[PDB]
Amino acid sequence: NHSLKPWNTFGIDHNAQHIVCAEDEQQLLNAWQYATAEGQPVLILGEGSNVLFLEDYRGTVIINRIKGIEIHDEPDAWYLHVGAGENWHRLVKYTLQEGMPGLENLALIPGCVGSSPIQNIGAYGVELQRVCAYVDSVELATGKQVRLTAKECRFGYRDSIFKHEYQDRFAIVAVGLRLPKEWQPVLTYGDLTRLDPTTVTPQQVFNAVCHMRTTKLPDPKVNGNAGSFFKNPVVSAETAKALLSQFPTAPNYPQADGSVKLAAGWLIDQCQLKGMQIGGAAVHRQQALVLINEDNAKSEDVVQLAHHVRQKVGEKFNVWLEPEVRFIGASGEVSAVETIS
Numbered sequence: 001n002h003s004l005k006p007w008n009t010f011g012i013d014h015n016a017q018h019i020v021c022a023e024d025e026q027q028l029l030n031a032w033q034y035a036t037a038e039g040q041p042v043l044i045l046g047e048g049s050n051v052l053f054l055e056d057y058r059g060t061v062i063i064n065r066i067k068g069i070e071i072h073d074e075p076d077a078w079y080l081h082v083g084a085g086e087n088w089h090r091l092v093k094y095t096l097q098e099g100m101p102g103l104e105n106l107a108l109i110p111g112c113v114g115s116s117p118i119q120n121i122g123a124y125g126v127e128l129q130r131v132c133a134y135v136d137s138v139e140l141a142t143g144k145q146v147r148l149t150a151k152e153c154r155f156g157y158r159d160s161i162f163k164h165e166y167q168d169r170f171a172i173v174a175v176g177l178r179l180p181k182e183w184q185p186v187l188t189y190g191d192l193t194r195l196d197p198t199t200v201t202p203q204q205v206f207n208a209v210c211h212m213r214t215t216k217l218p219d220p221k222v223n224g225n226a227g228s229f230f231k232n233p234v235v236s237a238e239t240a241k242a243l244l245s246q247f248p249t250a251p252n253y254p255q256a257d258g259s260v261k262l263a264a265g266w267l268i269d270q271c272q273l274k275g276m277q278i279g280g281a282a283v284h285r286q287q288a289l290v291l292i293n294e295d296n297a298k299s300e301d302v303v304q305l306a307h308h309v310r311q312k313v314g315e316k317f318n319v320w321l322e323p324e325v326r327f328i329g330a331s332g333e334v335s336a337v338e339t340i341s
């Protein structure tokens with residue numbers, strides 16, 4: 001019925017039975033019961049910057065546009081209650097304008113605020129769990145409100161409880177953020193290490209990060225994409241050691257649990273996949289992990305190319321990449337790994 005092309009950054013042109021913009025929590029709950037009473041599946045979307053529509057969605061797509069930014073003062077920090085429909089970068093830009101630093105490393109990350117805790121948005125040595133106080137959700141079937149604390153969200157690398165037992169039944173309506181008044185700059189990543197720690201300000205980091213991302217990362221407006229198509233593979237300590245014996249120059253960081261996060265873009269580049277094209281789908285020439293809609297790409301083309309990238313990295317390194325972009329079937333979420341396997 002209705003084209004989803006304007007509602008996803010990848011530029012995939014599939015149809016949805018019905019599309020509605022929810023301005024508040026109750027309108028989202030109302031749109032749920034109706035579609036659910038009609039026997040339709042319901043998909044809660046934000047800005048669509050990390051979704052891959054595989055085919056026509058045979059249901060209702062509720063676009064979360066719940067606005068609001070409340071500020072609460074405590075002696076040692078600022079507490080922000082932000083609506084799920086708020087643009088993330090606009091919020092990051094707003095907080096720095098009001099003199100509330102903390103989100104400057106997460107600048108220019110696309111998508112809404114409601115989607116930020118789902119895969120714990122992270123960039124330049126900072127993740128959302130660092131500043132997340134809580135996340136508000138409504139049980140879609142009943143309309144009952146639930147406030148999960150930062151600990152209850154079970155944040156990990158591109159992972160949270162909203163990708164598991166809170167995935168299907170719940171819709172995020174608000175996100176709580178704690179910004180410490182005693183600001184501590186995170187400058188241990190890339191070209192931010194070249195900033196002077198003694199004189200660095202939140203705005204200098206924000207402007208630096210925005211310039212780094214604009215010049216280096218692929219823009220969906222030039223060629224449609226959903227950021228990094230694959231996650232940076234988090235492998236075991238022994239698996240990382242065996243790989244580093246053969247490939248000692250492989251970029252890697254040790255994790256809290258003792259696992260090892262390997263660079264996906266590096267592994268893909270080492271297989272000579274830059275510029276590889278399956279139809280309209282293409283691997284970007286700078287950021288190899290970013291798949292792009294180069295020329296009227298089918299959703300099959302992207303899945304076909306993603307499989308080919310996964311297989312070549314798998315045969316060379318014995319490391320099997322998992323998609324960070326979420327795959328949407330005809331009736332809702334599907335296993336992205338099983339689709340590319």
Ligand SMILES: Cc1cc2nc3c(=O)[nH]c(=O)nc-3n(C[C@H](O)[C@H](O)[C@H](O)COP(=O)(O)OP(=O)(O)OC[C@H]3O[C@@H](n4cnc5c(N)ncnc54)[C@H](O)[C@@H]3O)c2cc1C
Pocket residue numbers: 009043044045046047048049050051064084109110111112113114115116118119120121122123170171172173217218219220225226227228326333
């Ligand atoms: C150029 C580019 C760069 C990117 N860089 C990064 C980066 O550096 N770091 C990073 O972590 N991510 C990055 N991303 C991915 C993206 O910014 C995030 O994953 C973001 O959280 C998605 O927000 P969205 O509103 O667009 O979500 P959508 O794509 O609309 O939705 C994503 C998923 O979350 C679900 N969802 C959305 N809202 C709700 C809700 N209210 N309740 C329940 N489920 C919901 C959807 O059902 C879907 O399954 C990038 C993307 C692009 C295109």
Ligand SMILES: O=C1O/C(=C\c2cccc3ccccc23)C(O)=C1c1ccc(Cl)cc1
Pocket residue numbers: 217218226227228232251252253261262263264265287289290
């Ligand atoms: O360019 C990147 O390097 C990333 C991660 C790493 C960078 C440098 C060293 C690393 C070492 C180990 C693991 C990851 C990285 C990354 O995560 C992106 C990225 C993020 C978003 C988009 Cl859209 C494109 C690329």
